[PDB]
Amino acid sequence: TEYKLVVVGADGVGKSALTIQLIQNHFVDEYDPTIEDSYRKQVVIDGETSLLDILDTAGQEEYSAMRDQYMRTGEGFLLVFAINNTKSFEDIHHYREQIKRVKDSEDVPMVLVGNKSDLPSRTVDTKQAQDLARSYGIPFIETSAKTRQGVDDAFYTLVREIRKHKEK
Ligand SMILES: C#Cc1c(F)ccc2cc(O)cc(-c3ncc4c(N5C[C@H]6CC[C@@H](C5)N6)nc(OC[C@@]56CCCN5C[C@H](F)C6)nc4c3F)c12
Ligand SMILES: Nc1nc2c(ncn2[C@@H]2O[C@H](COP(=O)(O)OP(=O)(O)O)[C@@H](O)[C@H]2O)c(=O)[nH]1
Ligand SMILES: [Mg+2]
């Protein structure tokens, strides 16, 4: 099965670092902050061979019709913030609403991802993120793209959310 996964959130939260951890199994310090691109990873998840096509979003904020239609083809979304950046957490509502807007649905597979969990300079409490994810009805996964903590869990959980959505 193929899955179109989309990684969204504010600049600097670690979308590209998370993506490259999944694709290449290491931490890329410098990934061009402006570049939006996609990558495939083939993996077996709960016994099913899965082709994950991951869109790592970036670039200028714009809402062209092409862009709405492209985002609408995403099947599941990682809502990424960084635990050291409160503005990135406050921006999660916006990304969730843009997904709901283009998919014309209140029920889109999503996972809330609190990245940079290796850093000591926390300004977003785990409880804040758990409360937000509970209010959205979605899982919350703590990650570090630096150490790889939680990375497979975030992507595989999103795949499991898509499978559950298909059966509703
Ligand atoms: C993603 C996505 C996205 C979706 F998931 C779903 C559907 C979408 C349909 C669209 O047509 C288009 C998008 C889409 N594309 C790019 C965005 C973006 N950029 C600028 C920077 C920060 C990330 C990256 C890309 N580089 N930024 C903000 O918002 C930033 C803030 C801060 C300044 C003002 N805005 C409004 C809020 F306050 C938050 N939204 C964006 C957005 F919705 C969509
Ligand atoms: N310590 C730490 N740094 C991170 C982590 N994820 C990303 N970074 C760093 O944060 C910056 C922004 O990461 P990037 O992947 O470009 O974020 P993007 O703009 O969301 O694609 C870079 O300096 C990364 O090396 C993480 O989990 N831990
Ligand atoms: Mg990036």
CATH number at residue 157: 3.40.50.300
Query: Does residue 34 contact residue 59 with C-beta atoms inside 8 Å?
Result: yes
Q: Amino acid identity, residue 67?
A: R
**What's the structural domain count of the chain?**
1
Ligand 2 contacts CB of residue 62 (under 6 A): no
Distance in angstroms (rounded) separating the CA atoms of residues 60 and 75: 23
Q: How many residues does the chain have?
A: 168
**Closest-lying ligand 2 atom to the alpha carbon of residue 144:** 27
The experimental technique behind this entry is X-ray
CA 82 from centroid of its chain's CA atoms: 12
Alpha helix (H) residue ranges in the chain: 15-24, 65-72, 86-90, 92-103, 126-136, 151-167
Residue 9 CB contacts under 8 Å (≥ 6 apart), including other chains: 15, 57, 78, 79, 80, 81, 88, 91, 92, 95, 113
Ramachandran class of 115: left when φ > 0, alpha when ψ lies in -120 to 50, beta otherwise: beta
Expressed in angstroms, the distance from the first to the final Cα of the chain is: 18
- Among 1, 2, 6, smallest CA distance to 108 is for 6
Q: Measured in angstroms, how far is the CA atom of residue 91 from the centroid of ligand 1?
A: 9
Work out the angle at residue 67's Cα, subtended by the Cα atoms of residues 66 and 73, and round it to the nearest 5 degrees: 95
Q: Domain containing 124: what range?
A: 2-167
Distance in angstroms (rounded) separating the CA atoms of residues 29 and 96: 27
Ligand 2 contacts CB of residue 12 (under 6 A): yes
Residue nearest to atom 15 of ligand 1 (CA): 61
Query: Does residue 50 contact residue 1 with C-beta atoms inside 8 Å?
Result: yes
